[PDB]
Amino acid sequence: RFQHVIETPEPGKWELSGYEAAVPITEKSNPLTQDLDKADAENIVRLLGQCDAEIFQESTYQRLYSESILTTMVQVAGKVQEVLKEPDGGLVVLSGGGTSGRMAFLMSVSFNQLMKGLGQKPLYTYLIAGGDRSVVASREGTEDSALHGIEELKKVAAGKKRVIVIGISVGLSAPFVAGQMDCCMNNTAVFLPVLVGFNPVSMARNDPIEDWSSTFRQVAERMQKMQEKQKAFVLNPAIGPEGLSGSSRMKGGSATKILLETLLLAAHKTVDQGIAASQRCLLEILRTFERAHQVTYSQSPKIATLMKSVSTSLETTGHVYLVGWQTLGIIAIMDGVECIHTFGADFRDVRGFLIGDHSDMFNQKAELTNQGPQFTFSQEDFLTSILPSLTEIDTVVFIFTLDDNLTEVQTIVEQVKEKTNHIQALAHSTVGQTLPIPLKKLFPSIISITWPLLFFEYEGNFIQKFQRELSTKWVLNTVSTGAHVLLGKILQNHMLDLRISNSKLFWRALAMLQRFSGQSKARCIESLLRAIHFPQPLSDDIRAAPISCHVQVAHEKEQVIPIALLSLLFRCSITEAQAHLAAAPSVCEAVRSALA
């Protein structure tokens, strides 16, 4: 089970080690954020903002703006436009786990809306590991089945003649996506698979998939071979490590969003306007999103103030609600859910809600209706289940544009204000518009982001919406990440308080123990499995169990890594490690104290 795990380098021998050389870029520590754990709110905004801008930075080798990546984008838009020209029997599927699956969902929503607005039959669908419940809840373990990915693809593709399958996995990791790409390659008469991720192919996961005979790396290598015949495409730009190691929802999520929106817009422009995709025109769009970074981070002082407000509510416990209008609600939902595994948050801590119409978005909304508190997300859920129980310690962030129903915004804000003073808004406007006076009075320190008009004949209005969604994503992801960092939930720039919710996260947890303890691979595996299964003692059957067993047992547990790490550092029992942790103000402080 652990053959691919490299032995821990000896003390002082980490420099130039084979262990370090094998760390995927998506898992690497960012050299600019080693002191993220102790940074104040303003410094966290600066660090995370710098990292967010790295996706656009043009060595120029395989970067997002490189000729190589742009050429692949032109080729993929060429294949997509062939499907858009033949709606009868055509389909575009986007797929992934976690944030990658939620990005697949968002792309399908955006592009089906684009098609509906033009009076065309919608041709997009999404596949998210675990189904619709995964859009709103933490169900990361569902991506560990390649067969689940294949079964879901077969269901949506049944009866179709030509299917583009865009498999998204930031780490080139998810078994759900590997299975789909592999099966697409078995029938190139119908399927055109496109793999989107942010590692070199040689860094794709090569550990065994429990229900598949090829590893992700083997599938990606087969795609490279098929790309020579234009039968598959690997779209894997270099963006560099995340500010919080392995936090694929951040740069990886942003780069996924911009890469796909740009190439899909180019495919639609080819069909509708007759202008073929080009490197020049892809860059004009990508650079518009680059400008959105400056526009957004010009609000760094207010982003830091909001981060502190959210962190105060969490420290007291209170809950934080991110209430977004229309598609900004999807961005809000995407933010809250990731806090569960990233920081060990409870599902009640940070939750996003969508105000407005969601009727054409979900393919199986029955999987969500009256399913429990972990599945709330709608306008009705917010008004009927959340609002009546709001207290003075809760924070509510409202995200909207000046084109939204501002009477409805004002009504809901006033209802919330009766329960808590901790309200703030992120309002997007087009240069020329001003916020109604009653909203200026309700939000005297509103985060106002003003956007110049765009004059792209075809894509202008779509880009205007997309850049506001990206801007919202940067603000919310920086606020939620920072709010938890301020509470001592990370160590250096590593997710100390991670929940081991899937196999990728299990490997991250094991690697974290090797890195911070410096102890052997055997000792770190033993401590990790002992902490996961506690109070069940370790047995040979547990040591030999599939990783899925460890994930099932670990996924709802808190502080597994600091318990396993303190056990290694103090050479103590789990109960002694739990006592050490209980006596400290945070997991960050307990581990820093043990390391000193």
Site for ligand F1P, rule CB under 6 A? 96-100, 140, 143, 169-171, 173-174, 248-249, 338, 341, 502, 504-505
Nearest to 184 by CA among 201, 202, 166, 169: 166
Nearer to ligand F1P, 96 or 237 (CB): 96
Give the residue ranges of DSSP H helices in 54-145: 67-85, 98-117, 133-136
Our finding on whether 346 is near Ca ion (CB under 5 A) is: no
Total binding residues toward Ca ion, as defined by CB under 5 A: 1
Q: Which stretch binds Ca ion (CB under 5 A): 28-36, 169-177, 297-305, 554-562?
A: 554-562
The piece of 8-16, 368-376, 494-502, 553-561 that touches Ca ion (CB under 5 A) is: 553-561
Residue 169 interface partner, choices ligand F1P, Ca ion, none, CB cut-off 5-8 Å depending on type: ligand F1P
Of 395, 412, 396, 394, nearest in space to 404 by CA: 412
Task: Identify which of residues 202 and 407 has a Cβ nearer to ligand F1P in the complex.
Answer: 202
- From the list ligand F1P, Ca ion, none, partner contacted by residue 556 (C-beta under 5 to 8 A by kind): Ca ion
Question: Which ranges constitute the DSSP H helices of 350-444?
Answer: 379-381, 406-417, 437-442
Q: What are the structure tokens assigned to 118, written together?
A: 């033009």
Shortest spacing between CB 138 and ligand F1P, in angstroms: 9
- Pick between residue 181 and residue 577 the one whose CB is nearest to ligand F1P: 181
> Smallest distance from the beta carbon of 178 to ligand F1P, in angstroms?
10
Q: Cβ of 392: how many Cβ atoms within 10 Å?
A: 10
CA distance 578 to 567: 9
For residues 8 and 514, give the distance between their C-alpha atoms in angstroms, rounded to a whole number.
Answer: 6
The residues near 84 (Cβ < 8 Å, ≥ 6 apart) are: 90, 92, 123, 267, 268, 271
Of 177-185, 224-232, 321-329, 556-564, which segment contacts Ca ion by CB under 5 A? 556-564
With respect to ligand F1P, which residue has the nearer C-beta, 112 or 248?
248
What is the residue type of 243?
G
Q: Quick one: what does residue 478 bind among ligand F1P, Ca ion, none, with the CB cut-off 5 to 8 Å set by partner type?
A: none
Is residue 575 marked as binding? no
| Cis ω for the linkage preceding 535 (within 30 of 0) | yes
Closer residue to ligand F1P, CB minimum distance, 171 or 240:
171
CA atoms within a 13 Å half-sphere pointing along the CA-CB vector of 251: 31
- Determine whether the annotation assigns residue 408 to a binding site: no
Q: How far is the CB of 373 from ligand F1P (least distance, A)?
A: 21
| CB neighbour list of residue 294: distance below 8 Å, 6 or more residues apart | none
Nearer to ligand F1P, 442 or 505 (CB): 505
Closest CB to ligand F1P: residue number:
98
Q: At its nearest, how many Å lie between ligand F1P and the CB of residue 260?
A: 13
The C-alpha angle 405, 408, 410, rounded to 5 degrees, equals: 110
How far apart CA 110 and CA 256 sit, in angstroms, is: 14
Q: Which is nearer to ligand F1P, 254 or 567 (CB)?
A: 254
Nearest to 459 by CA among 167, 63, 110: 110
Q: Minimum distance between the CB of residue 209 and ligand F1P, rounded to whole angstroms? A: 13
| Residue 504 interaction partner, one of Ca ion, ligand F1P, none, beta carbon < 5-8 Å per kind | ligand F1P
At residue 509, the 3 state secondary structure works out as helix
- Contact assessment for residue 116 and residue 356, using Cβ atoms and an 8 Å cutoff: no
Contacts with 120 (C-beta within 8 Å, 6 or more apart), sequence order: 87
Tokens linked to 445: 């320190």
Q: Is 504 annotated as a binding residue?
A: yes
Distance, CA of 368 to CA of 376 (rounded, Å): 8
Minimal distance, residue 394 CB to Ca ion, in Å: 21
Of 226 and 339, the one with the shorter C-beta distance to ligand F1P is 339
95 assigned to a ligand binding site: no
Binding site partner of 497, from Ca ion, ligand F1P, none, Cβ cut-off 5-8 A by kind: none
- Which one-letter amino acid corresponds to residue 216? F
Query: Packing angle between helix 67-85 and helix 251-273, nearest 10 degrees?
Result: 50
Q: Which stretch binds Ca ion (CB under 5 A): 285-293, 418-426, 453-461, 549-557?
A: 549-557
Find the binder of Ca ion among 67, 556, 575, 595 (CB under 5 A): 556
Site for Ca ion in 423-462 (CB under 5 A): none
What is the C-alpha separation between 214 and 175, in angstroms, rounded?
A: 10
With a CB cutoff of 8 Å and minimum separation 6, the contacts of 80 are: 92, 164, 263, 264, 267
Q: Which residue lies nearest Ca ion, judged by its C-beta?
A: 556
Residue 556 known to bind ligand: no
171 is in an annotated binding site: yes
Cβ of residue 26: shortest distance to ligand F1P, in angstroms? Answer: 6
Residue 557 token pair: 């547990």
Rounded to a whole number of angstroms, the minimum distance from the CB of residue 504 to ligand F1P is: 5
Q: How far is the CB of 503 from ligand F1P (least distance, A)?
A: 9
Beta strands in 416-553 (DSSP E): 423-430, 447-451
Nearer to Ca ion, 74 or 554 (CB): 554
Q: Which does 174 bind (CB under 5 to 8 A by kind): Ca ion, ligand F1P, none?
A: ligand F1P
169 in a labelled binding site: yes
Residue 68 marked as a ligand binder: no
Yes or no: say if 498 and 508 are a contact pair by the CB < 8 Å rule. yes
Report the chain's C-alpha Rg in angstroms.
Answer: 23
Known binding residues are 99-100, 143, 169-171, 338, 504
Residues making up the annotated binding site for beta-D-fructose 1-phosphate are 99-100, 143, 169-171, 338, 504
Q: Write out the residues near Ca ion by the rule CB under 5 A.
A: 556
